[PDB]
Amino acid sequence: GMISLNNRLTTVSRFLKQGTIADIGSDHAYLPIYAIQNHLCECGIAGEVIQGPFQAAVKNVAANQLVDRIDVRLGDGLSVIQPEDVIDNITICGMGGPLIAKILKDGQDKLSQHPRLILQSNIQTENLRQTLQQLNYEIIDEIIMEEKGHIYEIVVAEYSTELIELSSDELKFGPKLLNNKNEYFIKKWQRELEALYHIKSKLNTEQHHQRLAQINDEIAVIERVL
Numbered sequence: 342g343m344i345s346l347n348n349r350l351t352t353v354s355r356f357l358k359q360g361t362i363a364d365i366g367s368d369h370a371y372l373p374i375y376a377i378q379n380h381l382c383e384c385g386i387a388g389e390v391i392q393g394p395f396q397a398a399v400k401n402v403a404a405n406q407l408v409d410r411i412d413v414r415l416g417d418g419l420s421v422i423q424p425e426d427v428i429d430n431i432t433i434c435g436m437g438g439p440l441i442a443k444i445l446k447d448g449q450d451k452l453s454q455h456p457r458l459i460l461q462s463n464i465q466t467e468n469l470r471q472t473l474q475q476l477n478y479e480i481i482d483e484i485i486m487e488e489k490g491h492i493y494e495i496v497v498a499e500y501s502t503e504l505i506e507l508s509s510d511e512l513k514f515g516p517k518l519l520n521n522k523n524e525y526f527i528k529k530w531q532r533e534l535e536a537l538y539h540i541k542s543k544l545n546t547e548q549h550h551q552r553l554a555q556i557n558d559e560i561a562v563i564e565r566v567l
């Protein structure tokens with residue numbers, strides 16, 4: 342159609358099922374707009390937690406003549422989801438893994454129709470995988486990619502009638518990403534190693550036993566997997 346998306350959100354779009362997208366903390370509604378303009382979805386919901394992004398989303402939907410196809414809603418996380426909604430995809434992008442985890446856990450009652458989740462985590466994706474496990478979700482695909490020098494992870498999950506247990510390594514590194522360790526996987530975890538050794542340059546070993554035990558364990562895990 343009209344809108345151009347970054348590679349990060351275009352990658353997310355390739356996992357959308359037909360029907361309705363609910364985009365939580367939406368990018369000015371640009372992902373739902375793109376999804377409808379490109380015939381990936383026929384309807385959208387754009388959730389925003391504060392007024393500025395809310396009004397920008399309303400403006401952009403109007404400007405793209407999609408008022409009757411994308412509902413822009415003000416509320417925190419999955420609170421925007423209403424009981425009459427029929428939702429085929431929930432997208433939560435451009436957030437840290439812990440925030441996406443808290444949105445899904447706090448909003449777990451909104452997942453009863455078992456939509457596909459497409460989550461794009463900026464950092465600490467382990468917390469998100471822990472939460473998906475707790476919610477009877479199963480990771481079906483993962484992408485790890487780079488844009489403007491920042492490495493992002495995309496996690497695609499669907500409901501399972503039994504809880505799917507992941508190992509510590511799977512939770513931290515990704516059960517799909519671990520089995521397909523591409524250049525961006527290596528780059529990400531080498532950078533994390535550098536960051537963890539750099540913290541050890543700033544912490545006296547006499548004064549930070551607890552924090553240093555966690556950092557040294559994390560280093561050992563990454564050094565084993567790399």
Ligand SMILES: C[S@@+](CC[C@H](N)C(=O)[O-])C[C@H]1O[C@@H](n2cnc3c(N)ncnc32)[C@H](O)[C@@H]1O
Nearest residue numbers: 365366367368389390391394416417418434435
């Ligand atoms: C970094 S931007 C991400 C924008 C877009 N999803 C993307 O991937 O580029 C984070 C957006 O999420 C919104 N946000 C943060 N906390 C939120 C929450 N609890 N519920 C909904 N939106 C939230 C912010 O206000 C902001 O609009």
